[PDB]
């Protein structure tokens, strides 16, 4: 009530952390996750937190540069996430905010909202006018094998209570995809939802061919069958597909979603908070998905996702893949295959000795 | 014939150069142009050259990082621009190549083609199976005023022989746009083509309103009336517009053009070699534009553009705006309002003392 807090500075650092569980692709395991950690100091005793997953270390320095540079021009500015977005939008209209820039802007938006929650002793979800209801979740893996992996899967379903599993495919031929899926369904029975993520690996005609073959296995969705930019190719797959098509982890801001929806690219979407424009963009897209009747899930950043899904009219699944555990004070918790938001703000605090250990520069 | 050259290293540096002529926007003049200069050393006594215009210094370091990092993984690799593109494509499929990354990849592609021309003593246009025919050009300004600017305009048309001028608008109200355009047409007579660039400043309904008012002035095109990502809004303007709609300077790679064309966003396109994916992407888009019967122009990078326009089936205009003069050995030449390609390769050589003077780090 007294006055709106204001930004006094912004800091970001790189870390390469160990994964709680290495996930293995066709070539090899990934056991390292490169992140960027963002702090937005305010004039009211609160520093806002957020992280980005950066995919490859090659992106660490640029992202740190961009976050810090953008943050600097913001010092002195009132902490109003809507007005700040509009400012960052005007600022990159010509250079363009798709890509690394876009991640910097979304990261900052998350940090902003996080500060606002802290400053109120509330979780963001309550700022957003909803509550931290538990959200059905699914557990995300690389290339699963039924024999070689029965162990970890039993755990996910029985202890953590996961009622849905995602695996990857596409790397090889149709035979491998099918065997992998035949195994999984046999092993897990009919009551577990199985999702298959092709990670953009196919072209539209090949996607159509594989999907027809996999339809007998009761899949919940096929994810990014073709390159993410190829919206017309997604729509073409979607049109012929007996299985719901999921995509969206790689699209940029509300406009990026508007054009994908206009093209009818997918049955389901799963925006990444890093790429859709933070909490502020997410909410915009939530309204679009409501109008288009499209079930909306999240792509990673499970901690913050849990704050927006409860106010997403078409909320679907929260993806669980944990990259930020080892550097958080309070890793993510799944209870009976659901995640519940944690306050205050986004519930993101750094385990500083953890950070110091893993920091790269 | 003996063996295909191979990459041995890649270097990039930042410079902020003075413009041959400061161009003034509504707020103020821009007299500084931030660039990144790219060298790709080969094992055959040739280093490939290319530059990027980086819009804002804030992008200088990230771009240098990205070019050098990407280049490093390429050392040892045979200098085959098609195979190299496909490699950089696989490498960023998940992180995404829109944005800064995309500029790094296009820059590298230009450098590659430049080396290939040098290594043959030829201009790239001849590598591409065409010839360095002169290309009609137009001269690009900021917010012009007829009284206050008659002087520089007389020069452009009379000495350099420019038969086409572009100015900016949108910053203010319709009244200002109209007066500015009424002045220009009165001053330059009916034989000079006038283009108006709104630089994404309007929304679709406002764009429609202004364009209807400006139609009496015989404009050649209206450029980016609305945000570049808003393809559906462009199509909506285009549908109602009596004046050709031009756009494309901000779209990403061939797929980005494919979706814009699929959406019917514009009557004309003008890809930026930095954003369309270098020479290799350009050529792809050239074929798309041919099929869609869309006149294709270039956005800046006038030196390299002059090498691809002669093999672009729907070649239209080459945009002249000079940023790289002060650091080139051979600035750009316009003769009788046309530009002709200069070899060998892309005809890009550094004036090294010039560079040393302007380099930023
Ligand atoms: O859907 C998903 O999570 C995958 O596409 C994915 C993307 C990026 C990192 C890990 C996994
Ligand atoms: O069409 C154009 O050249 C303008 O949009 C423009 C873009 C970027 C820098 C200068 C000018
Ligand atoms: Mg995915
Ligand atoms: Mg323009």
């Amino acid at each position: 009530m007294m006055t709106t807090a204001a930004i006094t500075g912004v800091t970001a650092r790189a870390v390469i952390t160990p994964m709680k569980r290495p996930l293995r692709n066709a070539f090899g395991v990934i056991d390292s996750g490169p992140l960027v950690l963002i702090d937005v100091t305010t004039d009211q005793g609160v520093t806002g937190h957020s992280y980005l997953f950066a995919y490859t270390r090659l992106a660490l320095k640029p992202l740190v540069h961009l976050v810090e540079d953008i943050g600097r021009e913001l010092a002195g500015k009132a902490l109003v996430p809507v007005d700040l977005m509009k400012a960052m939008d005007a600022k990159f209209r010509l250079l363009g905010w798709q890509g690394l820039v876009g991640m910097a802007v979304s990261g900052l938006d998350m940090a902003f909202w996080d500060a606002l929650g802290q400053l109120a002793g509330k979780p963001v979800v309550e700022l957003l006018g909803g509550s931290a209801r538990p959200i059905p979740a699914y557990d995300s893996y690389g290339v699963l094998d039924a024999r070689d992996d029965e162990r970890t899967l039993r755990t996910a379903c029985d202890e953590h209570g996961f009622r849905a599993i995602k695996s990857k495919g596409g790397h090889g031929d149709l035979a491998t995809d099918e065997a992998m899926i035949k195994g999984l369904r046999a092993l897990l029975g009919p009551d577990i939802a199985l999702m298959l993520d092709f990670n953009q690996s196919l072209d539209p005609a090949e996607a159509t061919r594989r999907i027809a073959r996999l339809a007998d296995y009761d899949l919940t969705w096929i994810e990014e069958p073709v390159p993410q930019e190829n919206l017309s190719g997604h729509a073409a797959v979607r049109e012929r597909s007996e299985i719901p098509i999921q995509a969206g982890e790689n699209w940029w801001f509300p406009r990026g979603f508007a054009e994908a929806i206009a093209a009818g690219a997918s049955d389901f979407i799963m925006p990444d908070l890093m790429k859709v424009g933070g909490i502020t963009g997410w909410l915009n897209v939530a309204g679009q998905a409501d109008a288009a009747s499209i079930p909306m899930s999240s792509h990673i950043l499970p901690e913050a996702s849990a704050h927006v899904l409860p106010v997403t009219p078409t909320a679907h699944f929260l993806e669980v893949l944990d990259f930020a555990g080892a550097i958080l004070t309070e890793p993510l918790r799944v209870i009976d295959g659901k995640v519940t938001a944690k306050g205050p703000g986004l519930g993101l605090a750094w385990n500083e000795s953890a950070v110091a250990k893993y920091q790269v520069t």
Side-chain angles (χ1 to χ4, degrees), chain A residues 166 197 199 223-224 249 270:
Chain A
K166 197 164 87 186
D197 189 334
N199 285 101
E223 175 182 330
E224 287 182 314
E249 84 192 35
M270 47 182 290

Side-chain angles (χ1 to χ4, degrees), chain A residues 93-150:
Chain A
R93 197 105 298 290
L94 307 174
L95 165 63
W97 66 357
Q98 293 75 47
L100 302 181
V101 171
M103 303 172 72
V105 168
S106 302
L108 290 172
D109 175 89
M110 279 183 293
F112 300 155
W113 277 101
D114 172 69
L116 283 187
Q118 286 195 71
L119 300 176
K122 292 175 171 172
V124 174
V125 67
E126 297 187 16
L127 290 207
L128 297 187
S131 75
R133 333 200 269 70
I135 303 302
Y138 72 86
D139 195 30
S140 176
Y141 295 81
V143 186
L144 286 168
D145 187 312
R147 9 158 182 152
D148 292 350
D149 273 290
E150 168 178 9

Side-chain angles (χ1 to χ4, degrees), chain A residues 66-150 152-283:
Chain A
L66 296 170
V67 169
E68 305 213 308
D69 284 328
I70 300 167
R72 203 147 47 240
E73 328 221 18
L74 303 178
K77 285 277 189 296
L79 191 72
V80 193
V82 171
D83 298 349
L84 291 159
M85 188 55 57
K86 185 183 302 263
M88 293 184 274
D89 196 8
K91 178 185 167 61
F92 295 103
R93 197 105 298 290
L94 307 174
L95 165 63
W97 66 357
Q98 293 75 47
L100 302 181
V101 171
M103 303 172 72
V105 168
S106 302
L108 290 172
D109 175 89
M110 279 183 293
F112 300 155
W113 277 101
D114 172 69
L116 283 187
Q118 286 195 71
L119 300 176
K122 292 175 171 172
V124 174
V125 67
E126 297 187 16
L127 290 207
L128 297 187
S131 75
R133 333 200 269 70
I135 303 302
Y138 72 86
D139 195 30
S140 176
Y141 295 81
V143 186
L144 286 168
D145 187 312
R147 9 158 182 152
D148 292 350
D149 273 290
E150 168 178 9
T152 339
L153 291 168
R154 249 63 144 99
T155 316
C157 301
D158 296 331
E159 175 69 39
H160 309 291
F162 273 117
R163 285 304 171 262
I165 307 292
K166 197 164 87 186
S167 161
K168 314 197 179 184
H171 54 269
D173 59 355
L174 178 52
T176 307
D177 284 332
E178 175 159 28
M180 171 190 63
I181 298 285
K182 196 186 177 172
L184 295 185
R185 173 61 69 210
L187 170 67
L188 295 168
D191 287 352
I192 307 305
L194 285 180
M195 292 90 161
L196 179 59
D197 189 334
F198 281 125
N199 285 101
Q200 303 180 68
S201 73
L202 303 179
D203 70 18
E206 182 66 8
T208 288
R209 196 182 63 93
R210 298 205 178 191
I211 299 174
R213 191 69 63 85
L214 297 171
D216 277 0
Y217 302 112
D218 195 32
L219 303 179
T220 286
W221 75 52
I222 298 292
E223 175 182 330
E224 287 182 314
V226 314
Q228 54 105 350
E229 300 101 332
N230 191 357
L231 300 176
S232 295
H234 273 87
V237 173
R238 182 203 178 194
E239 168 68 16
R240 287 263 246 118
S241 173
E242 290 289 54
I243 309 169
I245 299 301
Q246 172 72 280
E249 84 192 35
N250 289 321
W251 299 337
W252 299 104
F253 294 88
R255 189 57 59 193
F257 279 85
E259 299 301 333
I261 286 170
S266 66
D267 297 297
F268 294 164
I269 58 175
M270 47 182 290
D272 186 312
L273 284 158
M274 294 182 304
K275 292 173 167 175
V276 74
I279 302 301
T280 288
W282 177 284
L283 284 176

Side-chain angles (χ1 to χ4, degrees), chain A residues 301-323:
Chain A
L301 269 58
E303 306 85 354
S305 301
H307 290 263
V308 286
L309 277 158
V311 298
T312 301
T314 67
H316 198 193
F317 281 103
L318 175 153
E319 181 177 27
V320 173
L321 185 54
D322 190 3
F323 283 107

